[PDB]
Amino acid sequence: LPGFATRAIHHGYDPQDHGGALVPPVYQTATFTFPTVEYGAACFAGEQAGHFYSRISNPTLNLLEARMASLEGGEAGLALASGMGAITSTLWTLLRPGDEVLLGNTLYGCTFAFLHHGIGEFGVKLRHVDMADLQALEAAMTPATRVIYFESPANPNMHMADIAGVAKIARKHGATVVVDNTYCTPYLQRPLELGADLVVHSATKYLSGHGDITAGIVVGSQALVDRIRLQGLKDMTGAVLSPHDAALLMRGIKTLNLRMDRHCANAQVLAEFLARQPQVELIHYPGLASFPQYTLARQQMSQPGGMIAFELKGGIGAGRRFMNALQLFSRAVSLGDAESLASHPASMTHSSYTPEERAHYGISEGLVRLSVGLEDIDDLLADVQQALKASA
Amino acid sequence: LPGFATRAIHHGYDPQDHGGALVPPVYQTATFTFPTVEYGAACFAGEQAGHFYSRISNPTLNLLEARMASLEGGEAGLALASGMGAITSTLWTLLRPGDEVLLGNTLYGCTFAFLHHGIGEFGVKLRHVDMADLQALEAAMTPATRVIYFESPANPNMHMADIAGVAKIARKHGATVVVDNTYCTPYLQRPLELGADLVVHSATKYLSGHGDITAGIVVGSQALVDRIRLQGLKDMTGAVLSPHDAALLMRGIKTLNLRMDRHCANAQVLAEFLARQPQVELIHYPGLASFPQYTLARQQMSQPGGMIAFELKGGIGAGRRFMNALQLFSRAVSLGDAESLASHPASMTHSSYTPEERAHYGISEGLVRLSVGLEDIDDLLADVQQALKASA
Amino acid sequence: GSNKLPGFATRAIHHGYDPQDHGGALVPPVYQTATFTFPTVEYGAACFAGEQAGHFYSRISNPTLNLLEARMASLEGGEAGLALASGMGAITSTLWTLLRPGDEVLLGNTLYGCTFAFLHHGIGEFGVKLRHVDMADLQALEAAMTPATRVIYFESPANPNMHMADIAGVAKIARKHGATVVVDNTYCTPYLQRPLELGADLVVHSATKYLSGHGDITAGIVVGSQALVDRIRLQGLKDMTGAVLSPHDAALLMRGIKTLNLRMDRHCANAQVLAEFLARQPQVELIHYPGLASFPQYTLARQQMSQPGGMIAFELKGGIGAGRRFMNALQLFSRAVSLGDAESLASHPASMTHSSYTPEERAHYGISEGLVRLSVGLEDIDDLLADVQQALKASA
Amino acid sequence: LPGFATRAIHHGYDPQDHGGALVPPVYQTATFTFPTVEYGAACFAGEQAGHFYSRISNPTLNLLEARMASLEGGEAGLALASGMGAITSTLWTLLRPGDEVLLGNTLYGCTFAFLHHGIGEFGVKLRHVDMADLQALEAAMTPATRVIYFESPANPNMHMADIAGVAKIARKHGATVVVDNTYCTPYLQRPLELGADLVVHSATKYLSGHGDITAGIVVGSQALVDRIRLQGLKDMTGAVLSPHDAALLMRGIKTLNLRMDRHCANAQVLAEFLARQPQVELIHYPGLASFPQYTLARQQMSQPGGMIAFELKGGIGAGRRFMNALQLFSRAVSLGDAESLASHPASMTHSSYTPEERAHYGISEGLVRLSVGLEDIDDLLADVQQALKASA
């Protein structure tokens, strides 16, 4: 079985099948024609091998999908126009009115919004549970529970879930487990190997790695993916990935291993640096020994990731001053880009919220999140250094 | 107000604001950075211009939207990853359980599937009505009726609706009118100017014109489009259009007047040809005086369009054989490309159904649909001629 | 029957591609790949010799570029095509392969500025003898031919006065003496004029202009005999220029070619209306447009060009102060130097391009102080008329 | 001065200057317009301006150029359509009939072809010298010697030149030193900091790193680069770089350091393995102690590189048999891609030539060249090991 890097570069493509082309040709075409109409008849049912549109079986998209399936250890993959494309397409197909879905304590903000103000407003029961608490999860299960969905690590405190534990319970009650694995990528964590049924990504982040495309991936069993493809994507979302964007994603995946290696190595030095500084109240980085769940993190993740969360003494005040003083880090909401990014949700995303109710969302007053990029650590250290001084 | 072609080329763009570039730069970027956090704070209550993330808005996508809204004559536009992206995003935000949606008698297959096997299984009521029959439409109106959605012309037989008459009946009961204007484009038909609240396109078709991208457009009021943007696209479908694909769509829109002129002139000659051939049982082209709704077609569409539906005397077998004989037309289920296309639903998209099942949904055994392309009319006539001899 | 040639539009959209041979893909896949591989090493031995038809490296050939080339060949009526990084890529690659020190090249009286520069300050400085001739004067061309005359190169219509050459007449003189004729066909495209069908050996294009049609790519084409195009591919392009066309940009070029016939029809119809309007205006001293009888080479234009083109040149009364104020009054026309874009462009040589020079130096080289040049775009003619009408008013 | 990786990601770009866009917009435009004729006046021999036409100046090309300048430590950069475009544009600008150019003993095939079958047939004189031999170089200088051109390391046997020594000699005769730095990249070797005047790159190789674009770079002093831009590029080649390709090139450059580190580590291992094998007569790799110019290589290269050449004992047959046995390595003539590549000149690039002409040229019958990619090293070893066995 060839290694991860090899697969990320080569899996599902032999140059001999496309006129010797070393890089697969991009199928920037909206539709495909048939040799006969009897060949056309077959395509819509399924029993002849081939393809019928860009919204289903484009070969550029098929290669992306297969390759992501191999990296995550799944049978099947699906490419979509965004991470929200992947999440919505998945949940829209697996759920109907009367079904219940269990969720991690905290979710990505647009995932939250979709559940509460979207699919939850169409008669689907929403329930929140701490997914490191196996006992509380078992007490939450009802006979209507069709889907369990969470992130691990989850934003913003890097809260881990016991994926193998959750999956064991879910397998008892006939529930489907869906893990958003955006933060780790398959290089660092493979939740399908710990017993999850489906994984979903915002490929916009680390997989692409260059902040230039928006894209989502679903990986899991052939049977779950076929359904999500033919119902969620085809009928209910229309979140079709451009073959141009899919080829840029495959391009980015070719350096995934190296990029994540650098993200992690930079993030550790920065996290260890933050630990020794007097402006920092507390840190959430999985590779510090003081991280509450350092044990579980190491069982699931092979390295501690590129994301650092920390809190500043001075709260909201010290955050604004820290963020505005950064000259190399950019002030922005994304993650997993080559460029280093900083976010202080109290004064950026959630300055439309009040301090009195802010703590209901698990958001500390002075919490600043850092996506550590690929820049020289010395320059990133110096930029962080002077911004901590400007926050006092 | 400058002419259509001037606006299709120029609207919403001055080179002088982008270093004099004649063609606008392509904003191929997932995220946008802020100068400070209090500047960033503004943008998450809609207080400042510029932007934050490409899943919500992007300057290339804004220009496409502005331009498309100018051409339909509407206030605001939204760009999405596909036509189904446009339709689902729209309806997901406008309907909730208990609401009724009133549908035209026939619909594009995937739209039918969204309604019957998607949103209609989440407790939204569906009723089908002949939109040409304004008495029966009035009769169908309940106060639960929140949306009237149709295509004009509609698949499969080019059936039409008096748009202004439907808008009148909507105004009376307080329902929102959504018209799928894919076939006509804003060049031949402007439903917003006849009372519709919203229009949706598969920009994949004529607007692109070249078969290379998948894309969707919503046009209407700022109020409705802002909702569809912030709920349907942002939370519920995730169908984000790639900036690369938006820039191609804009390139296609610059020749839309020229292409539609040639599309229409070619189909007219081809329609008049088919009406005289012994193998043809009947024919539906809006440009023929024998079209059932000829008067309504000259009233609403400025030209008769590029699509032809006709039925062969020999039923399903003659259809197959006609389809297989085509050498210049391709066998495919799209339309509005430079290449002429053909499909025969009874042997392609609807084959495993029986004759009874297809007559129920309006599809004759010998119904053939031609998308007349931009090729030399003599070559297309010659290809059609021989395929008809082959059909017997 | 089936030995009839498909019409121009049919071939612009279909020629040399079948979706069935690439998985049903309606649009051909883009081979954005720098390199190709070999199944055995013996398959690779033949592909650097000439025995086995295949693919080696994209600076020589690539299937996206090949399709583009076979298609342009068909439209021009040539055996073969080559695609390059720019118009000047096509020209330099062609002239660098055909000429050596001691050979003479006969040139039209006017040329595109970068071509002029290439010949006088480039290849002419490497031992290649240059000679200018009026190519509309067949007696003067006959007279300037020598035994060293290897290539006759010209544009028709020529930048910027739109001086025409008798292509058939030039090719006959070239048959007799033995020279290779190279025509820059940028202005007309294969839709309006096909120099190879009139006897030229090679044609070159700046496909950046009308062939693209949308101002977004830089590209060149050469069309001619298999032997010469091959020679140009393997000597000029491969060793001497490296002006490789990106497969992305070639795909866009093929996209633009699919509407070439429709865009040119509208360019021509807009410029005809605009030319007739400008002729009847008080401020206009004279106007140059091939579709007007007052065009110095009216009958030559009608003989070689199936329509009169999208380019107009005219002169304003009032000199430079009039031209300056005309240009700054334009609100739809953009001030810029190019042609064959969807957007209408205007340049005023005096206050723009030839600004460093004085009014005396511009009397030399035939550039009037009110000489405006127009690339008529695809916008609604009433808007273009209006923009020119209000601009003339402000130039008074 | 920030570190290499920081500059590779950020140099010459502030998101704040383009509406916050994290990735810079792609200026895919052939022409630029002017606000007035007076602004237009100062771009045709223009002092205080931006740009006029993409064959001379485009913001996207300008950014790539300034970034590549920073990495090589030179004043100005120029982007072109291919490496051969960069070489030819340079040499067409600097040489005229009667000038001599002094060449390294071996050259990349097309460069040699340019020199002997292009510019050398236009009156320019050619002389080949060993550029490690400072006394032979001094003996070869003449008053006609205007350019000294070479690669370091050089195809086929990784032969090095003493760049600082060469530059000292060129200085005494006023000659311009041009170095092809394609193999090392500015990450491993910066010939301008060793006294060279100009560097050229086939960015098609390592700079891109993913095998999808053809691109050339020239970097050097302002006055030289200006002339190559306005003469070589503008007039004599027309080798204009597509902005789309420049944007991809810039994408690839953001991981150059990480990619190069891995290319080198993979190649170091494979060289160690190949030196000890029975089938291997000789090996040329800068990282081995047995490499003739080991000390000179370590003075100029911070790491030994990703390229290996070695000779098989069994001659032409062993080469042929080895190449055909490869399953993971592709048979192909490029280099610096993520995918590992192999070429055996004597049965591929130089098959037509006689054994006597190959020896004269520098090519051994069993000379195999490896471009070691980014795959998992254990897979690359397996593939090489079995191919070595099949070589019998």
UniProtKB/Swiss-Prot annotation, chain C:
Induction: Is under the control of the positive transcriptional regulator MdeR. Forms part of an operon with mdeB. SUPFAM superfamilies: PLP-dependent transferases. The modification N6-(pyridoxal phosphate)lysine is found at residue 209. InterPro entries: Cys/Met-Metab_PyrdxlP-dep_enz (IPR000277), Cys_met_metab_PP (IPR054542), L-Met_gamma_lys (IPR006237), PyrdxlP-dep_Trfase (IPR015424), PyrdxlP-dep_Trfase_major (IPR015421), PyrdxlP-dep_Trfase_small (IPR015422). Substrate binds at residues 112, 373. Its cofactor is pyridoxal 5'-phosphate. Signal peptide: none annotated. GO terms for biological process: transsulfuration. Keywords: Lyase, Pyridoxal phosphate. Transmembrane segments: none annotated. Changing residue 114 to H: Drastic decrease of the catalytic efficiency of the elimination reaction with L-methionine, by 6700-fold, and increases that with L-cysteine by 7-fold, mainly due to changes in kcat. Pyridoxal 5'-phosphate binds at residues 57-59, 87-88, 206-208. Its EC number is 4.4.1.11, 4.4.1.2. CDD domains: CGS_like. The keyword Lyase applies. It is an enzyme of class 4 (lyase). Belongs to the trans-sulfuration enzymes family. L-methionine gamma-lyase subfamily. Catalyzes the alpha,gamma-elimination of L-methionine to produce methanethiol, 2-oxobutanoate and ammonia. Is involved in L-methionine catabolism. In fact, shows a multicatalytic function since it also catalyzes gamma-replacement of L-methionine with thiol compounds, alpha,gamma-elimination and gamma-replacement reactions of L-homocysteine and its S-substituted derivatives, O-substituted-L-homoserines and DL-selenomethionine, and, to a lesser extent, alpha,beta-elimination and beta-replacement reactions of L-cysteine, S-methyl-L-cysteine, and O-acetyl-L-serine. Homotetramer; dimer of active dimers. This is L-methionine gamma-lyase. The lineage of its organism: Bacteria, Pseudomonadati, Pseudomonadota, Gammaproteobacteria, Pseudomonadales.
